[PDB]
Amino acid sequence: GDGDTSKDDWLWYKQPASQTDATATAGGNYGNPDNNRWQQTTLPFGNGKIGGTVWGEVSRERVTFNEETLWTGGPGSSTSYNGGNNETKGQNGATLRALNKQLANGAETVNPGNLTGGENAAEQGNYLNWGDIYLDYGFNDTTVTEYRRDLNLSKGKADVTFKHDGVTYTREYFASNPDNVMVARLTASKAGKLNFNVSMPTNTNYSKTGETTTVKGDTLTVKGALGNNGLLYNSQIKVVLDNGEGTLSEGSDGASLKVSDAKAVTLYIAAATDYKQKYPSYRTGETAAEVNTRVAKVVQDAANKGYTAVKKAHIDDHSAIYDRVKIDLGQSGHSSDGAVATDALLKAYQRGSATTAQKRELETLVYKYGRYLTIGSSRENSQLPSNLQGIWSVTAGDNAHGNTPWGSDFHMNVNLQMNYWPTYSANMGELAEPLIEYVEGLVKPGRVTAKVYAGAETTNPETTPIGEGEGYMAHTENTAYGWTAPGQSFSWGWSPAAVPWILQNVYEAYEYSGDPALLDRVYALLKEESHFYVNYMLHKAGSSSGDRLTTGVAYSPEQGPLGTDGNTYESSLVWQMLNDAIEAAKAKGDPDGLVGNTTDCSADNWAKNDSGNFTDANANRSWSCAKSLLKPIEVGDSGQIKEWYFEGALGKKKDGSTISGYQADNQHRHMSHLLGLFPGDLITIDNSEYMDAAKTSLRYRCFKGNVLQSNTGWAIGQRINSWARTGDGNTTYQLVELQLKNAMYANLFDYHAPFQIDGNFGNTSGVDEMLLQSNSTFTDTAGKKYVNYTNILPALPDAWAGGSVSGLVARGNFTVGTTWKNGKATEVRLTSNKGKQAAVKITAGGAQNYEVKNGDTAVNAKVVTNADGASLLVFDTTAGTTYTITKK
Ligand SMILES: [Ca+2]
């Protein structure tokens, strides 16, 4: 039994998916109404590896099915797979070198069009919908009463119930991480009334070799190999009748199992491929028989444990993570008097008829869903991080840019980053593990790309540890198979700062934990990528970009000239990487002596000969020196953050002429030059000069006249987080409102359109950043610095006058709870998990007005103040202790 579910968080609906509103914009690849219905109406669950999306149909029930490693492309997709790298284009770095020389000699722009790769869509591949589980009850009439379908976010399961011709039928679905198995629990209220056919057809749109569907005893097996690349796949459904009551027989089609005259059944569903994240073969080495044996043991082991035990272990595991964070903004819920279904709730929110409690319900549900979706798509033992769709998809085809939008891939120039923005602050740090492994997984294939396009060759690349090579390069479109080449067209295909950027998400695993094992891993990654940038990528700018190091030829997605002499986007990212790398080094005592200093530090130190080697072997090219020479931020003549170093007024060059390709209405969708504001620490509340300029930049991008503009997907996700960092909670909240009104389907999937999970994760992160920030550095008037200080309620919306949150995490590894009333903090609970010095700003109240206690015991806390009158409480902590901060 479920017991008391009154306090659980539910998405819920009074009708099946087929009857649920799917009228929002469908987007590319969703012209088929059935596929569009899937993305707008079905309810997801997963264990980080396998996933389902539940339709809740009355008679022909459907659970769309996924496994995270079902990927076309990679080795075996051609006779020459090499991660997309094109030697003729790269010329071992010569192409890039010559373009940079043109810029260094004074060109304002160049044509970087030859910097491409990745031409074969069959080699690139994409993520596939595996297929579907169908449970066909064979009802003559679909007419029912007492229908409900729900997703219980608290217990990590989907439910369906209805009454048909006097009989109540129930369904429950979950995917257990501990037991690595999907469970469907099916009941009828009257004995003999549970009758259904179970099948598991693979998606009919990808090519296959040697697929069979067979029944033996209580188990249905579908197995074969992908036609595109020979990847082996195997799924099994084991049907277990309660008390042996009922009859189990082979379906008349020979491709299904028939349950007759039963009352209750448990289905155990498992699936696997022979994928392995192992360069260059990307296979386990198992035979089809071995995969089959492995999957069979999963379902048998689960059945042996039994439904009650498997369910208990699942709910314990799921809730252990899910229940870490609680948030109370005054929301209604499914147990409230006059509770409204989630689709009805969304509609009311859109129409402006939702009550305050209902608005808070939708806002907190969407927030919580981002956490839920992390648990479902990204577990410690996932083989791959969440992709553009987490793990959930209905579309499939063999080739990239085919039947599935953007291949449901790893899009590493904002999207994958966004997937891992709430992971730490929302107390799910362990769930970043597959991202860390993925980025480690880019090193071997990326060393090939680094050699081809930048001339950075690692000798003995197989045995040279991460950190000790010459560099690894990867771009926007990535896959399960080390597709680290740039894409076929420069504008969208080339973006080597994607690696620096994703390294930010990786380094945050250390920032938020203080875990020395993570420190070693992130340091190794940062060491080699910093080596790569310092030695191969950076150059002294030509006259168009002033006196600084830049990253050479660069595009600012997705406006302006194709190739300028660096830009704010790339310089902000490289600056942040070197900053993180220096911090990682310092935390280890700089054993490699790479931090250096700014003594005899000049962009002239980067001088190279015709072959691309430094002419001065002994010049200072240390991380500190390189970082100091980027000068990534310049405020322009419109008080804006410059996007290009040749910029004067907004969208203009210093001579007043047009920046060709700049979107003249100032409302370009990308804000690539603001990554230093979010996620970075280049532009923070502690630097008014830069922050005022960033706010000006944001206003031009986000407003048409005086009206704040809606956006969708990654763009709205980015804007929410960016505005949160400014401290303007009202504008930030207004963007959350716009996301909910204009970028959420009935099942609360974020849309671009089509469905893109990035914005779901971006929402959760954005709410976190409104309530807690921990990325900035405070400087008191005596000059003392407090790095990564805990900032309570930095961008609290006036719309949320009172509330509480518990279980957020701040950098330095502090768990944070806060309660507020009339727009001001009444309590902060700060749990020090690692014993680091506490430094606490209370934006909504002023920390100087508060005092710190350990239970009843007064804690010595110094008040420090900066030049603008902002204060911190500074105090020692001990790991394991919670400190309570209240008004004096
Ligand atoms: Ca996954």
From TrEMBL:
Disulfide pairings: C601-C625
Q: Which organism is it from?
A: Bifidobacterium bifidum
Residues in coiled coil: none
Q: Where is Ca(2+) 1 bound in this sequence?
A: E68, S377
Read off the lineage from the record.
Answer: Bacteria, Bacillati, Actinomycetota, Actinomycetes, Bifidobacteriales
Disordered, as annotated region: 70-91
Protein name, as recorded? Alpha-fucosidase
Record's compositionally biased regions (Polar residues):
77-91
User: Which positions in this protein are listed as binding Ca(2+) 2?
Assistant: E68, S377, L384
The positions annotated for binding Ca(2+) 3 are E511, D681
